[PDB]
């Protein structure tokens with residue numbers, strides 16, 4: 061009672077929408093989702109509270125392993141929980157956590173003078189001051205943390221945590237106690253319009269279309285030209301060239317209101333069948349969306365702003381004296397079960413094999429694929445997507461035959477399934493099949509494609525769908541998936557077209573984890589304080605000097621409310637990272653337009669690893685930066701899987717709200733511009749500006765350490781050269797290129813990509829060529845090693861080109877201005893040269909790299 065009320069108020073606060081607003085809609089679809097998903101999520105919670113302690117570690121602290129894992133001597137520091145005493149010992153990189161734990165237990169038994177009761181099977185290793193653990197049958201070098209410690213030269217710091225301490229964690233965090241006979245053409249009545257705004261010199265026209273995804277089910281139909289006014293009256297029948305029996309389940313009726321002398325005013329879409337498969341009848345008031353002509357990919361829910369929105373009043377006629385439902389799967393299978401099998405020649409079989417292993421088709425090739433659909437199922441099951449595109453979705457008998465084959469179709473690889481989630485495959489059985497083939501995704505693969513799967517939610521026609529249930533069950537079984545599902549949904553609550561669906565998904569999730577809701581509320585409280593702090597800085601910076609604005613910012617941070625809200629939270633960029641004590645004296649802001657905040661933290665328990673920073677940005681849209689950074693991280697994963705480590709810096713970037721988000725601070729790094737300022741009285745002051753970077757690296761890496769710093773520079777430079785080329789990242793200058801003290805180079809501020817439209821050439825800078833060449837004019841041994849790294853990295857990506865295309869195609873749903881149409885994805889097809897052999901593509905890359913070298917020489921000549 062009292063606790064249910066508190067939880068409801070806490071969910072309302074967290075999701076940024078009062079739960080009463082869901083009830084105020086008196087919508088049965090909203091109500092059924094809330095009830096079904098509350099039940100499904102609470103069952104997930106009860107399953108969790110009973111997990112074994114190692115399974116609970118898999119839930120809460122999923123393993124962070126090196127892509128390769130999916131000899132060498134090592135020093136490790138181990139302490140036991142609650143002890144100020146630690147033990148430093150030598151293990152091998154090939155040793156398993158259990159060997160290290162048994163070594164720590166022998167040390168404790170000798171130091172505490174007792175033959176211990178505890179066995180190493182009773183413990184897990186926590187990374188000090190982090191929500192990260194090392195457990196399982198994996199050598200130590202396979203863990204991201206150990207791998208990171210080895211490369212940086214730092215000593216791993218671990219805590220032996222007993223099964224009883226993990227079980228106390230689990231307990232503390234528990235939840236509190238018949239259509240086919242209807243042959244008449246499809247038709248509607250266009251009654252009237254309301255709240256219409258347009259030039260009175262013009263006329264109003266309503267264009268109407270019937271769609272199955274992106275494809276027209278028949279020709280579009282227009283109303284008559286009526287004079288422009290606030291309340292236009294049509295009262296006319298619009299008839300389509302499609303029988304009511306041929307309407308597919310996922311048929312959408314799309315509208316566009318416009319003014320003619322073309323002038324787009326608004327658009328609205330609706331599904332012809334409801335969420336309970338009933339064919340819609342009666343009057344419908346369609347609260348239209350402003351047009352930026354038909355928009356089939358647009359949401360099928362009305363504009364919530366009923367006070368200002370233009371509205372179309374339509375009538376769906378009563379086609380039968382009884383409710384008509386879409387036929388059940390059993391009746392569809394019955395109809396599709398019958399149909400002649402393909403009996404063709406070996407030559408016509410060779411023409412079919414040529415096109416199925418090939419990508420648009422000619423009409424005769426379509427009729428052949430459809431004829432040979434049984435052979436597609438039995439010998440080319442990965443060509444399901446081609447066959448689905450040749451199916452005539454506007455003929456219920458052809459759809460029945462396709463659906464019969466699909467229900468016996470073998471499970472497809474993850475790559476094929478991601479393609480099948482595209483809006484070009486709108487059928488709910490195709491969608492269900494795609495999800496079934498994605499269930500085999502590992503948590504690491506799911507995490508990698510989470511952003512795209514969340515965007516796919518904007519294509520969903522109904523609230524209760526297989527994709528939401530899949531995403532919810534996977535989020536409730538893995539805290540890190542849960543974390544990022546919440547934030548991707550939360551960051552779009554200011555968008556009216558998704559606020560309902562997203563708010564309901566977050567409510568359902570919260571029912572499944574009360575503790576995690578409170579952890580996320582703490583993150584929201586910090587973000588709330590950061591926004592108020594940033595507004596103060598924006599105002600102050602325009603009136604006083606930077607050291608004055610910085611002092612006032614510190615004073616505001618020093619307030620009890622800010623110190624409490626800003627300290628002891630999980631990072632929204634990484635729930636493994638704990639943001640403990642805010643280091644006020646170290647906090648600052650950037651001189652740029654939006655004045656982003658630089659917030660520093662420290663943790664005594666994590667030591668050096670607890671020294672972390674976050675950038676809070678308000679005023680810019682960070683979605684494209686996040687997508688680019690995720691794509692670079694995917695490149696890094698793919699290269700490491702072929703044994704190529706290009707020493708990339710895929711730092712965190714997370715939109716959290718309306719033009720609001722966080723960026724991970726990469727410590728011990730500076731921009732090329734600051735280094736190239738060539739300031740006097742510094743360790744890097746150069747005779748020639750070209751020496752500055754190398755002198756800076758020399759000062760950070762004394763003696764023998766320079767060699768490895770030049771090598772890290774070369775590797776990351778090859779990785780970023782390929783990544784910016786493939787992704788079309790332009791506007792690259794000295795202030796958006798950074799360098800780490802280790803020698804690693806990385807890119808920041810990714811506002812423009814995919815050539816944005818001017819095709820971006822491969823980029824080579826003489827300042828970077830100089831470091832690669834170890835400060836020598838001619839050093840083709842070092843330069844050509846660099847070109848080899850570029851070529852190897854490029855050819856690895858091309859081999860996974862389809863994965864990038866499928867993910868970028870899913871991202872079209874994001875609404876990013878630079879990722880709107882097929883032209884934007886043409887850029888990625890061209891940069892990866894996928895319509896070529898590896899020989900023709902490598903030849904082409906060599907032409908572009910040599911062209912970039914000749915361009916770079918225009919700077920070398922001087």
Ligand SMILES: O=S(=O)(Nc1cc(-c2ccccc2)cnc1Cl)c1ccccc1
Nearest residue numbers: 650652656675723724725726795808809
């Ligand atoms: O305004 S900023 O603070 N935004 C930003 C900073 C970083 C960043 C990340 C890891 C270390 C360091 C800076 C990444 N992306 C962006 Cl858009 C910035 C700082 C320095 C140069 C230019 C822009």
